[PDB]
């Protein structure tokens, strides 16, 4: 029917893999738009780790 794992990868990655596998025989309508127009960053799940140690932020002050 589909894949409901959030952390495996982007929605695009799972959809095209299931279609290539042969389980999803009806291509979703939004898939064609995604191939023609991809976003700047692929939506891959990442854990928001907290910064420890001497590492600081790279944001510069506006002066």
């Amino acid at each position: 029917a589909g894949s409901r794992l959030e952390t495996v990868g982007s929605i695009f990655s799972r959809t095209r893999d299931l279609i290539r596998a042969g389980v999803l025989k009806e291509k979703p309508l939004w898939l064609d738009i995604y191939n023609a127009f991809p976003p700047l960053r692929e939506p891959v799940f990442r854990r928001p780790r907290l910064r420890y140690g001497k590492a600081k932020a790279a944001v510069q002050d506006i002066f």
Partner: protein, 220 residues
């Protein structure tokens, strides 16, 4: 059938098919207070690349990256509307709930600014009905609920493979949002501008779908 394939695949060959580049500009966004953000203390870790800088402890969002993201977001929104797609407006914020609800009515699309039930998008057959067509796109005008946690629809939509176009503030999590648009979601002028931009984007997509249909009808 072949002409049905032709009309579906026609707008895919033009990047500026809907001529959305004239709707907004850097100056237009700047006057809407879209470059402002929360304090430096609330800066989420994933929003660091999208921040131009911090002005006296107040983060400033880089509108140049906002314009690049917003251009794709509006372009992606129109195409899924062109193909007769269901669009849902989700925003759990008790200051623009009526405005967003009225915005969807004018565009003819659906809105859900009320309390979000747990098993709505996942356990759809029990909540709504036996056979229900899931929305093909979700728009988040606010990715946070009233308790400053990420909205449930953001996580559920990724489970159901539904693309989400959501405005992310400086304290949001754009990790699961496929088309993030870093901007300001608190000032009334900013929220009003985003709704109007999505109003014209949907209306143009609905109209230009009808115009090409008329041309197809007279083709044969």
């Amino acid at each position: 059938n072949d002409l049905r394939d032709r009309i579906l695949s026609e707008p895919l060959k033009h990047a500026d098919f809907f001529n959305l580049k004239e709707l907004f500009s850097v100056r237009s966004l700047f006057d809407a207070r879209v470059h402002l953000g929360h304090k430096a203390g609330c800066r989420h870790r994933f929003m660091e690349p999208y921040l131009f800088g911090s002005r006296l402890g107040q983060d400033i969002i880089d509108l140049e990256q906002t314009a690049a993201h917003l251009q794709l977001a509006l372009n992606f929104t129109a195409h899924v509307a062109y193909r007769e797609g269901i669009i849902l407006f989700v925003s759990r914020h008790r200051q623009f709930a009526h405005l967003i609800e009225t915005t969807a009515r004018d565009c003819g699309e659906y809105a859900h600014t009320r309390y979000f039930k747990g098993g709505l998008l996942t356990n759809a057959p029990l909540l709504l009905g036996p056979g229900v067509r899931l929305p093909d796109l979700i728009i988040f005008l606010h990715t946070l609920n009233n308790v400053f946690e990420p909205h449930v629809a953001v996580r559920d939509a990724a489970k159901m493979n539904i693309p989400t176009v959501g405005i992310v503030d400086t304290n949001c999590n754009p990790a699961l949002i496929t088309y993030p648009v870093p901007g300001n979601d608190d000032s009334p002028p900013a929220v009003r501008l985003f709704c109007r931009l999505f109003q014209v984007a949907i209306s143009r997509a609905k109209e230009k779908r009808r115009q090409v249909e008329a041309l197809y009808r007279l083709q044969g």
